[PDB]
Each structure stands twice: as structure tokens, then as C-alpha cells.
Amino acid sequence: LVTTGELFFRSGFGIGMRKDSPWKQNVSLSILKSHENGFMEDLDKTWV
Amino acid sequence: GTWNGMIGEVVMKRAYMAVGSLTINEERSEVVDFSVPFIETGISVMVSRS
Amino acid sequence: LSGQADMIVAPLTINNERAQYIEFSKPFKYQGLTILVKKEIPRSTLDS
Ligand SMILES: *[C@@H]1O[C@H](CO)[C@@H](O[C@@H]2O[C@H](CO)[C@@H](O)[C@H](O)[C@H]2NC(C)=O)[C@H](O)[C@H]1NC(C)=O
Ligand SMILES: O=C(O)[C@H]1CN(CCCP(=O)(O)O)CCN1
């Protein structure tokens, strides 16, 4: 299988639910914490 | 502990909203609110095409 | 929105509608958009 040309719609996937929940701030906290320890690269080397 | 520059202006309310090519950092996250980014970046490596 | 599940974890895009309905956190994983085809077996076509 081959990819195309140039990629478009350079978006992001994150996490969000109803507004009754300040958990999403802790979610941002966790994503930056893993930015400070290299954990998404662990997920990448495991899966992607 | 005291912020300067654009972050200092925002902290001291001198600058209400911020505009500039500044990335997202945890230290700034504790003192300001990071909005939704409009473009991506990160730890990239560039090499000669050769 | 009906209250069945509490939090969502899934790679969902963030368009305008569901963002108006519910807010989202930082995008844990960046992404783009590409067409996919099963390439083609290299074959030179000619008679003789
Ligand atoms: C969401 O993030 C907030 C931001 O800190 C967390 O709030 C802290 O809660 C801990 C105990 O859970 C306290 O010791 C801190 O004083 C709180 N900090 C502040 C200023 O809010 C919270 O833990 C996270 N999750 C929850 C449970 O909401
Ligand atoms: O947020 C900021 O302050 C700027 C800073 N720039 C730093 C350039 C990389 P280095 O620090 O020189 O290694 C990147 C864009 N955002």
C-alpha cells in the first residue's frame, strides 16, 4: 500500500466530553507530562 | 519565578491576549491558558538532500 | 450527550459541531489525511 502526494487537513486528535468535567485539563497535563518523558514515542514504537 | 517578555506581559495583564509563534510549555500552562494550536511542530531533524 | 458513557477515548477528529456541543482537550496525536491505493505490480506492456 502507498500513500499520496502531500497530506492535507493537518489536524489533531485529542479527548473531550460534556462540559461538566475539568478532567480535560488533567488530560492536557498528562499529555505534556508524557511530552516530558517520551511516552507517545513508546506508543509509536509499540504500534505505529 | 517572575515571568518576563510576552509571558510576563500576559501574567501582569499588560497584554490581554497573546499572539506569536510560541510553542506549548508546562511552565506557561500553569500561568496562562493555551488555546487550540493552528499548526504543528516538534523535535525535527533536517539533513542535506544530497 | 445522553449520559451513557462518562469519558470518550478514541481517535476522533474535532469539527465545529461536536466542538460547539462539547469542548475538547489538547490533541494527543497529530494527524493528516491521505488517499490509499494498493499500488500496482510493475509490468512493462508490449507485444513482442
Ligand atoms: C484535575 O487537575 C486539578 C488541578 O490541580 C487537580 O486539582 C488538585 O487536586 C489535588 C488532589 O486531587 C489537590 O491536592 C490539589 O490542591 C489540587 N490542585 C488544584 C489547585 O486544583 C485534580 O487532582 C485533577 N483531577 C481532579 C480530581 O479533578
Ligand atoms: O515559544 C517560544 O519561546 C519559541 C521559541 N523557539 C525556540 C527555538 C528552539 P531553541 O530554544 O533555540 O532550541 C521555538 C518557537 N517558539
Calpha distance C16→B14 (Å, rounded): 32
Name C11's Cβ contacts closer than 8 Å, sequence gap at least 6. A13, C29, C31
Instruction: Fill in the amino acid letter for A35.
Output: H
> Which runs of E-coded beta strand occur in C3-47?
29-33, 36-37
Give me the residues paired with residue C36 across strands: A3
- Record the cell numbers describing residue B11, joined without a space: 501574567
* Ligand having the closest approach to the CA of A30: 1
Residue showing cell 488533567 = A26
Tell me which residue in C6, C22, C32 faces A19 most closely, judged by beta carbons. Answer: C22
Calpha distance B20→B5 (Å, rounded): 12
> B interface mutation test: which of A11, A32, A36, A44 has the most B CBs within 10 A?
A32
Resolution, expressed in angstroms to one decimal: 5.4
Residues in chain C, total: 48
Comparing C-alpha atoms, which of C6, C29, C35 is closest to residue A40? C29
β-pairing, A8-13 with C29-33?
antiparallel
Calpha distance A43→A30 (Å, rounded): 14
Q: Please compute Rg for chain A using Cα positions.
A: 15
Calpha distance B9→B15 (Å, rounded): 5
Which residue in C has a C-alpha nearest to residue B24's C-alpha?
Answer: C26
Calpha distance B45→C32 (Å, rounded): 20
Give ∠ CA C38-C43-C48 in degrees, rounded to 5: 160
For residue C29, report the phi and psi dihedrals to the nearest 5 degrees. -145, 125
Instruction: Fill in the amino acid letter for C41.
Output: I
CB B49 within 8 A of CB B43: no
Structure determination method: cryo-EM
CB C26 within 8 A of CB A31: yes
Name B29's Cβ contacts closer than 8 Å, sequence gap at least 6. A28, A29, A32
Atom of ligand 2 nearest to the CA of B25: 1
CB A25 within 8 A of CB C25: yes
* Ligand having the closest approach to the CA of B21: 2
- Record the cell numbers describing residue A33, joined without a space: 507530562
